[PDB]
Structures are given as structure tokens and as C-alpha cells.
Design a binder for this molecule. Structure first.
Ligand SMILES: CNC(=O)c1cc(C(=O)N[C@H]2[C@@H]3COC[C@@H]32)cc2c1O[C@H](CF)[C@H]2c1ccccc1
Length: 113
């Protein structure tokens, strides 16, 4: 029950919230890796070097891959950054990213010290 454990429990709580029915209307594009081929996005992997999605964050959390809150937050923000890099700012998925990042940032800010 040390500080790192406690901070990663807060991260795990946020992760569960981002995956919850409450946010499903705007979270769903981030549930699984972007299927570039299926979506016809044949330039996706040329523009996005480091893909990230919530299923990958969940696997890394379950595998105890994250050693601290900062490492977890870096993956969640990489996921949003990839969305803002690849997509025109007027696309629905960017509006959805902004809304889910608002949920993330406000709760991440309530990290226990
Ligand atoms: C992280 N997800 C994505 O970046 C993403 C990109 C595109 C896309 O087609 N992006 C291309 C825009 C126009 O050309 C470059 C960018 C489409 C969708 C995406 O997530 C959903 C699939 F999970 C799918 C979606 C469908 C309808 C509404 C919202 C989201």
C-alpha cells in the first residue's frame, strides 16, 4: 500500500472509468487498436509510429508493466496525441478524443499525493 501502488490504483480507477458505459458514446473509438486496413487508413502506420489504445493500456496495467502514474499517463496521452496528429480537427473522432481527454485530465489531476 505504498505511494506508487496507491497512485497506480488511482490510474486503474481512471482506466475503469474510461472503459465504463458512462463514457461509451465518445470512448468507443479508443477501446481497441486502430484497424488501419479495415478503416482504409493505409497511411496510418506511416504517420503514427507508436499506436496506443485503452485495451493495450489495460493489458499493460494487468501485466504490472507500468511502474508509476507518469508512465500510465504517457500512454493515455500518446493515444490522444495520435488521434490529434492523424485526424483533421473537424472529424467526429477528434471531438470524441477531446471529451474523453477532459474526463482523463480532470480525474488524473485528483491523484493522491
Ligand atoms: C482512434 N480512432 C481513429 O483515429 C479513427 C479514425 C478514423 C478515420 O477514418 N480517420 C480518417 C479521417 C479522414 O482521413 C484522415 C482521417 C475513423 C474512426 C476512428 O475511430 C473509429 C474506429 F474505431 C472510427 C470512427 C468512425 C465514426 C466516428 C468516429 C470514429
Amino acid at each position: 500500500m505504498g505511494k506508487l501502488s496507491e497512485q497506480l490504483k488511482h490510474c486503474n480507477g481512471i482506466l475503469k472509468e474510461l472503459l465504463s458505459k458512462k463514457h461509451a458514446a465518445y470512448a468507443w473509438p479508443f477501446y481497441k487498436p486502430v484497424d488501419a486496413s479495415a478503416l482504409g487508413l493505409h497511411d496510418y502506420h506511416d504517420i503514427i509510429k507508436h499506436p496506443m489504445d485503452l485495451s493495450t493500456v489495460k493489458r499493460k496495467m494487468e501485466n504490472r508493466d507500468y511502474r508509476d502514474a507518469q508512465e500510465f499517463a504517457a500512454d493515455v496521452r500518446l493515444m490522444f496525441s495520435n488521434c490529434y496528429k492523424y485526424n483533421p480537427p473537424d472529424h467526429d473522432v477528434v471531438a470524441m478524443a477531446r471529451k474523453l481527454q477532459d474526463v482523463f485530465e480532470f480525474r488524473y489531476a485528483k491523484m493522491p499525493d
